[PDB]
Amino acid sequence: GALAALLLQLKLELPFDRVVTIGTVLVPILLVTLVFTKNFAEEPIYCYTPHNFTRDQALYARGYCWTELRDALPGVDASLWPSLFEHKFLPYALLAFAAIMYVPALGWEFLASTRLTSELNFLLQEIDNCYHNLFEKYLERRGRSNFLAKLYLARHVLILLLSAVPISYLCTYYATQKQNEFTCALGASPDPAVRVSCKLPSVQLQRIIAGVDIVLLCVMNLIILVNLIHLFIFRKSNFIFDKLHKVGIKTRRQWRRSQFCDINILAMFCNENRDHIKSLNRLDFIT
Amino acid sequence: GALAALLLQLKLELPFDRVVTIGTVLVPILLVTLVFTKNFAEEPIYCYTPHNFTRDQALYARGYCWTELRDALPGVDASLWPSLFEHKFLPYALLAFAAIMYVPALGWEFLASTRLTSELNFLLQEIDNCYHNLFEKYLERRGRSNFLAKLYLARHVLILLLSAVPISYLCTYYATQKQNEFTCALGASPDPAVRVSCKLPSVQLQRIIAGVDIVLLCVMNLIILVNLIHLFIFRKSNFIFDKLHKVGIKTRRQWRRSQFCDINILAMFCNENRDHIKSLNRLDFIT
Amino acid sequence: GALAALLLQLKLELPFDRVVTIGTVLVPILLVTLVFTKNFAEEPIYCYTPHNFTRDQALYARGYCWTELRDALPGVDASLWPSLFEHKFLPYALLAFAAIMYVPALGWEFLASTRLTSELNFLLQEIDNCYHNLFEKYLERRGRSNFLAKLYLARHVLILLLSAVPISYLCTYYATQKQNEFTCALGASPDPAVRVSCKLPSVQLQRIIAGVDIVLLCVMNLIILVNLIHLFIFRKSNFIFDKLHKVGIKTRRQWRRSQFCDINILAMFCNENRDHIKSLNRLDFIT
Amino acid sequence: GALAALLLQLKLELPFDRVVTIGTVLVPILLVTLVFTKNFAEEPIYCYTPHNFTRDQALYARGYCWTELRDALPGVDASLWPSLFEHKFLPYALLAFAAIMYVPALGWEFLASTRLTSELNFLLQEIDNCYHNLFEKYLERRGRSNFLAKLYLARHVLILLLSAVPISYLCTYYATQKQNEFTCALGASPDPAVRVSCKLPSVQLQRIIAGVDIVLLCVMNLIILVNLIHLFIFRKSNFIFDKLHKVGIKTRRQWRRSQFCDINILAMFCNENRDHIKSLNRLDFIT
Amino acid sequence: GALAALLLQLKLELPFDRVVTIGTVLVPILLVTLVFTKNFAEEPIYCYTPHNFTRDQALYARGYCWTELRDALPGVDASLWPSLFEHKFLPYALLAFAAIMYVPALGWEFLASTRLTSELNFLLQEIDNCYHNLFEKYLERRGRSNFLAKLYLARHVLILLLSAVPISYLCTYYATQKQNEFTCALGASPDPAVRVSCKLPSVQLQRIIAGVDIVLLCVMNLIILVNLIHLFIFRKSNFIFDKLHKVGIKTRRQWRRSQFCDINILAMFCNENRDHIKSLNRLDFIT
Amino acid sequence: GALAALLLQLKLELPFDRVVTIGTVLVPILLVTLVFTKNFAEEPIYCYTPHNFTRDQALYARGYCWTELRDALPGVDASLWPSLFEHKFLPYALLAFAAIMYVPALGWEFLASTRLTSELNFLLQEIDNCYHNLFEKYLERRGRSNFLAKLYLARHVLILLLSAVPISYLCTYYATQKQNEFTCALGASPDPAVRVSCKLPSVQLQRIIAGVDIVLLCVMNLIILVNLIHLFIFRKSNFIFDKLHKVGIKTRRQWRRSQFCDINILAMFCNENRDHIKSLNRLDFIT
Amino acid sequence: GALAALLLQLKLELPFDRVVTIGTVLVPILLVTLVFTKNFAEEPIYCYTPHNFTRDQALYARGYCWTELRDALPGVDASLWPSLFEHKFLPYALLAFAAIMYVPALGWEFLASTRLTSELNFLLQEIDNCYHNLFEKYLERRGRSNFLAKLYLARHVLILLLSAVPISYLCTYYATQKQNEFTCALGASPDPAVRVSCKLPSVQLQRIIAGVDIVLLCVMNLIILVNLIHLFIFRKSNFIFDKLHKVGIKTRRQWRRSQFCDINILAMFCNENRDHIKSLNRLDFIT
């Protein structure tokens, strides 16, 4: 059994989950690191300075106007001056969104690690016996359990619910703030405050990234809905039933009565692991 | 036994412990490293300088006002000037809190490494024999021991007690330190001391981090309490008893008389390692 | 079976796919990283400054004229001033093009991982028996399937369709914009706006890279078309039929009627994996 | 014996030694590296400069006042000026203290590597035989050797003696130096020496580190003393004697006549390696 | 067969190919990286500046005269001003020329990875049979094939053809351009253009590297020609025919008629893998 | 023999050699790297500059006074001016001393790699036979060879001889070079040479390192001498003779007639590898 | 044969070759990297500057005088001005010398890889048979081959011939150029050329390195000559003949007639691989 031992690793992750993970979590991290690399290659703020100022006072003006980040208008008190804090706060939101989106994929394993592996191992061992009524009675008990169905459905729906947060915040940022210049007003005269106008060269790129992320995240939300409806309603085929050719009449009406059956979920992992069963081709040609 | 030897590793850590560790220790390290990366990308302090000063005197003024970090008020002596030391000392507190929270996880292993492994190995070896009165007398002696219960309870209750320190310090920091500008007063005239006002651009981000960490640490404190009560009081089921179908009358009343039973802790570990026993499915279908 | 177990890995990617991948995806990444390395070794913009300006105002002028990146002309309002944004936006387009071109290679595996491996394993196991009528009837069912053919054609035809985007954008950039100098006009006089003329030293190299990429990507588009026509139309030879020497007359007219047959794709993989069969040389010399 | 060969690594380090090492050696290295990281993020010394000085003379003044590091007072000659050298020399003392504390742990292995392993292997091999008078006479000779006891006691007592150096120096430093400003007086007039006052921004953090290390190192000194007395005086139980159930009366008097017995040290090692013996549970239930 | 399995790797690359690769491809990469390391340790251009210029105008002058890289002469219009472009472009051309020459090594592997290693196993296996007429007729069919000869010849001749590009370009660069100074003329007067003379300190080292690479690449071109003629024409010896001692007269005339035989190429590979056959020494001493 | 194969590694290095290596070679490398890290964290030389000097002339003065490193005195010609080259040349001396001290340890292996291993393997194989007159006559021939003794003695004495160089140079450096200030005199007047006084802030730490290294290297010299005398003169016990209990009278008087015996060296190696013989404990209890 | 398979690696490199390589090739690389590390930690050239020069012209002057690197003298035209190019060109010469010296060691393997291993394996296999006339006649044929002798001599003599280049260039550099100052004369007056005096602080260390390399390389040249004469002329002993005790009278005078025997080279290799033969000690004691 050296060959079996060397290839004893069993796939426990459907390709659809991998596609969803790649399309949802991995790409935003790459975009965030690209934005960070671009942002740490230039000075943060560029703006003007009167003639009388020395170098140190100019440095203080730049630092203060970057730290405060508050606009000003003529004839209006400071109680109504607009702010631009999210222009500086944006990337950390995406950094947190990556993890909050990744949580469910890690959550599923802690519940599906062992039981599914044991059941799959037992079924694959049993397939050898049927090549030539312990198994017949097993389907009756196993086919009325709906624990796996009640868990697989829960994982997918939670992704849809958690997707309302990132889209809502990005949608209200893309079409709300377009300002790029403001009149910073530092108040101090330790020899009538002076006024400067400053520019933010960190906005023409973050605008584009916030637009691509909306489209990419919305497509993944739609593709989940179409697969879920088709899977549990329209599909009336089971892989295990086709390759067995010996099923009792007592299991006929049960299968088309309710689709919330354990054997429905178990049918996929056997299909995706058809390599490990060596009697598939020989048995298929018999019929 | 090549297949068994290749997979001879036995799980020893419960999933709940892993969840608690991830939710308690790992995240604050990431937040601290993010804060450090942000903080080491700018100057420490920006502030003003009179016209007569040269460059070196301005540099000395900046350094002295950063090092002293003391406020000033008119008409008040130096004996009552407020300080702002937390704004400089904050991150190391979190750095120490990470380790002081991580200690119990290391402490558990040094006491539970070997005995639990040996007992589990003996039990899993015995399960083969019961498929077809050493075990009958074994439960009488083993069921009256309470060493594991007296240790598992101690590990969880210690986390709750140690959680009073980090929360108490962070709560009083959130609602007390709100100042951002002060009038530093350096006293020296080696040709009536001059006065400058300085700004700290390292406070608008540390405020937010100190708020998220409170909520995250408080939720994990509550989730521990609910699980402890349910496991040791309300749950009246043992995994080993259900899959054996052979229990003496004498051991029946001892099970519900007290809950501090050694078999109770052993029951959970066997459930999470049900893969290693190959007679589970065959024996379950018998009943 | 230690020797077989050690060399249990089976080749799954055809050499043509590897050649296409190397010629399409890998090289643009190297060109992009070379461009980035060259571009991050100098200042972004070089230009002039009047005599009255101090240092800080000159720095502000440089930064503002780099950020705006807008031309100016005499006697024309600002509503018709040309822009040069792609000179700054170019490399990220190639960075995205690399991945959007690489997608189909990753897409192929998720569908061709298991079934092809199982079929190849069964055929290689069986080929020992033919050395000395399940196989005779096997070609009847297998030879009328066309799933693999309907998938292999889809992968190649999708590369050609996706090649219209990168070619169109690069073609309209190489021979449209050749400007290198412009008269930036910053408007502010907080003591009649001053005017400066600036130079972009990041255009003489990106022009050459955009030319080589056009030729390299166009050649791979042509080489795919010639191979597709030859493989499915002109080639009238099958590897298995040549080395079997026992085929019924029923499979003769079927093979010469339609080329959209499943064994045609399976023939190539067996030929490239002729090492794993040890009866090839002995059987070939028999005829 | 593949399973035995794969797990042939026998534990040789007691958990108490690991706890002492972690509590004594590892933590000071982390504190030292934290101090170094903090210290290499700022200029070494900040201080003032008269108006007539140019830039180069100011740089020389800073460097000279940092290098000399000597105080000054009015009306007192240079023969009585206080110094502050250890403020600069502190971290290397801790760096050396780490290694000088770590020496004994490395020293013990070179003497305890082989003999203990050989005797433990012999005992573990023999335990199989006793399941069903070489061993009876073996304890007579082995029980009268005190080499291991004479070595284990020496290792622990040496740690206590070596702990007088690091505590004495740190304790006498925490409460002798609170100065932070001094009046550096550089003497040179290459056109009545000028005087400047300088500040050291590397003292408010090294004070706290030198306080924590005192408490942490002192607690580990106390915990060693309590364990040594309990193990060699109060404890009147041997693991090997309890699990044998076949012992002679001749060894009874020698058991509590003297505690410097070889089997006493071997008793702990067998207890912590109870996994490697498979007859423990079966033999224990017999009594 | 553990010893055979452990040493199952078969050499499939003649030493001559390794020598050619090392002498042709590897060295230019080292020279290019040395040139890059030297060139990225100094400023690109040094030159003069009039007295009235400030710092920013001098920086613009340096940058503009580096970017334009155009000479100037008195009394001649700008349409005939000589250029010095390739002084900035040489290293990238060297990298491209070092990377292009790697195609044949990859092509040979792609075209002969499998067939040679599949065919050689039969010859290595049959040695046991010949120790004590399948092989007699085997050489008749195998000795009349010329596919391998038609491929080995193509690989070597293709190296010679692609070697005419690097030699032609480097030869016309070593003895054409020796200029080192020029009179850059920037035209702009935002208050009769000023004139400066600039120096390129990146030409005295690239001259030497372009000379060594000519000699090294030319020698490898000659050594290939002499080996090709000797192997296919003058050499009248076959390794297999010397170690078999049983060949028919039919195979005699054909071997000396045409040298374009598959057995000729297979002779060298068997000679370099004489270790894997253990009957060589015993059979050799028989004759 | 899987267990023997897994642990087939035989120790071929006495612990004393490891202790000497750690105490002699490893520590100076750590001290040198610490000195280098300290030395590359500050400017090399600090000193004064007259008022009329500009920045570039001050930089030239610093560079010249650092390069020349020559003192000056009033009324004395340049032929008698003292030098201070050691303060700049010191670390490379230690860097070379490390290797010149490490040479013998590498040298011994090239001569003791194979013969000792083979003879030890033969002896360990033989020990099995003696459990139940080839060996009786073996000691007669083996006991009259002194090759191993003539080599082990030579390795240790060469260490003592090579220790005269590093100690002699360091001792004369500690008590001779104490200067820290000098009056550099650069001679040039391209408008009576000016004079400056410079300070070297790289001497207060290299003095302490040169003191610790003297004590550490001297103690290791003494510990070698005491062990050499004890091993070859006072010790009158052999491990192989004690555990054999069967030696002829002919081998008795030759044992203490001369101590330059091969079995004397082999006695130590067998003792350190007592684990590999499993009959030690059983045979020892027999007597 | 698991033990033999695990230790199937046969030594092929003689210790003398390893000593020559480590003494010739490895050390110069370390010296070159030390020189590079020293040279890349300071400014390249320190040079003076008149009072009227601005900052940018001073920056130009240093670079121009460093690039030209040409001396000047009064009353002599530029046609006879000495140069100092090797002061800048030195390290690359050593970098190339390392590789040109390393070539032969890599060259020898491509010719000695296979046949030596095959012959050694056959002989070691044969040694088993002689423990109890194919081998008798083998020495007659093998003893008259001189291919290995004609190759081993060629490898060593080529090292001596290639040693004439590095020594000749270094000897003519140590005692030819000792200049350290020169009067650079930049000619340009774009408002009678000015003159400055420069300095090269990269000469006092390259002088010492060029002195050590002469001695180290010359000693290794002498040690090769003495070993070559002793091995092939004076030594009249063969290891294989001593341990066989069975040589014909025909084989006696041939060995003492000519020393260019293939068995002579093979004898040394067997001596260093005496571990792999287990009958060495048993056979040696027989005589």
Numbering used by the authors:
A (entry chain D), B (entry chain C), C (entry chain E), D (entry chain B), E (entry chain F), F (entry chain A), ...: 35 to 166, 208 to 266, 273 to 368
What does the paper say about this structure?
Cryo-EM structure determination was facilitated by fusion of a thermostabilized BRIL protein to the C-terminus of the PANX2 channel core. We determined the cryo-EM structure of PANX2EM to an overall resolution of 3.92 Å with applied C7 symmetry. The final refined atomic model, consisting of residues 35–166, 208–266, and 273–368, fits well into the cryo-EM density with good stereochemistry and is further corroborated by the conserved disulfide bonds in the extracellular domain. The human PANX2 channel forms a symmetric heptamer with a central ion conduction pore along the seven-fold symmetry axis. Each subunit consists of an intracellular N-terminal tail and a C-terminal domain (CTD), a TMD with four membrane-spanning helices TM1-4, and an ECD composed of two extracellular loops, ECL1 and ECL2, connecting TM1-TM2 and TM3-TM4, respectively. The ECD structure is reinforced by two pairs of disulfide bonds, C81-C279 and C99-C259, which crosslink the ECL1 and ECL2 loops. Each of the seven E1H helices harbors a conserved basic amino acid R89, and the seven arginine amino acids form a basic ring structure generating an electropositive extracellular constriction, which is additionally contributed by the E1H helix dipole. The hydrated pore diameter at this location is ~6 Å, sufficiently wide for passage of hydrated or partially dehydrated ions. On the intracellular side, a short α-helix (the N helix, residues 36-40) preceding TM1 constricts the pore with a diameter of ~12 Å, which presumably allows conduction of ions and small molecules. Nonetheless, in comparison with PANX1, the seven TMDs in PANX2 are positioned further apart, rendering a larger transmembrane vestibule.
